[PDB]
Design a protein around this nucleic acid. Structure first.
Ligand SMILES: Nc1ncnc2c1ncn2[C@@H]1O[C@H](COP(=O)(O)OP(=O)(O)OP(O)(O)=S)[C@@H](O)[C@H]1O
Ligand SMILES: [Mg+2]
Lengths: 97, 138, 49
DNA sequence: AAAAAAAAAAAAAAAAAAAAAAAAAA
DNA sequence: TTTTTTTTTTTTTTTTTTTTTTTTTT
């Protein structure tokens, strides 16, 4: 995803993943994240890091197969962001597994 | 219950003392969890909601609240359950048709998209009520 | 972002979520004007509105 | 017209649980 | 070099206390 240096916008239908992208950015900076803040107006937080890295979609149902989780077992995740000022360029990143 | 059985063995006074004291203590402190769990009948159950597919009968998702959802999901779930509960709570509680049918929504569709609003209106009309809407020029 | 009077910020990006959810046209316009006034790069999120 | 009993909401505090970072040992 | 142990800080939950208003009786 790219950002024009003169102000951009993000749009999309409901339940698409916009706040997922914004939280993936927010994780790299603050000391202790408050995930999914704007949904409740600014009073509580709901998600957690492991939930993101394993990609759980909805609370699901009972059973034992746990089909409501995407990745099971060994996994690798990487996040990176880029800042440019003038010629010089910096990258911030994290690797989890 | 335990105390009771001990009394059945005594047929001597301390069992009666303990049982009466337990009951008297339960009478007080009605704002604590134990008293609610012991006397109020409605506190002896647990509730949950489930989503079931139309054709057939299959559990697809079980929920105890509205946690972990996105923006529109919380709004639609809350509105749906509240309007269903209100529709039941009126006259059709004891059957017959409602005598006072109207419902007021404030800041309608402050966070949802077009399709969600369409579903909301469709469900609200299907429940058989009359609505008044309050929105800015959004 | 600038503790002293030296100005010249190094970080200049702001992020908003569900912007303009409970306001009319004039309010949004004034918010945008005020945000641009300080000289800050901005990002916006909106459910197609 | 004035005095007393009752009930619902707001606020402070104590107890409990959990996760991250440094020190120490095989 | 790898592993275990310990401490520290942050968050949530439940209990109790306090206050204001309403209704009734004299
Ligand atoms: N921890 C989680 N628990 C449950 N469902 C989740 C979780 N993380 C992601 N999801 C799902 O992933 C979807 C992605 O949507 P989100 O990014 O959360 O919200 P959105 O796409 O930004 O829509 P909005 O209302 O504009 S914020 C959600 O709607 C959920 O169904
Ligand atoms: Mg969220």
């Amino acid at each position: 995803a790219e950002i024009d240096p003169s102000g951009t916008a993000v749009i999309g239908p409901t339940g698409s993943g916009k706040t997922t992208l914004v939280d993936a950015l927010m994780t790299l900076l603050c000391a202790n994240p408050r995930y999914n803040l704007a949904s409740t107006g600014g009073h509580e937080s709901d998600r957690d890091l492991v939930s993101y890295v394993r990609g759980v979609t909805g609370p699901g149902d009972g059973g034992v197969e746990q089909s409501h989780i995407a990745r099971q077992g060994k996994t690798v995740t990487a996040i990176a962001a880029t800042l440019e000022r003038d010629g010089a360029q910096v990258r911030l990143g994290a690797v989890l597994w | 219950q335990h105390a009771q059985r001990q009394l059945n063995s005594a047929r001597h006074y301390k069992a009666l003392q303990a049982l009466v004291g337990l009951l008297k203590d339960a009478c007080e402190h009605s704002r604590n969890q134990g008293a609610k769990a012991l006397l109020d009948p409605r506190f002896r159950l647990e509730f949950a909601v489930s989503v079931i597919d139309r054709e057939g009968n299959n559990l697809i998702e079980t929920r105890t609240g509205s946690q972990g959802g996105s923006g529109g999901e919380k709004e639609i779930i809350a509105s749906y359950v509240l309007t269903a509960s209100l529709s039941y709570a009126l006259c059709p509680d004891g059957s017959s048709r409602p005598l006072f049918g109207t419902i007021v929504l404030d800041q309608a569709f402050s966070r949802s998209s077009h399709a969600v609003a369409g579903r909301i209106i469709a469900a609200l009309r299907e429940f058989g009520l009359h609505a008044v809407f309050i929105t800015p020029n959004k």
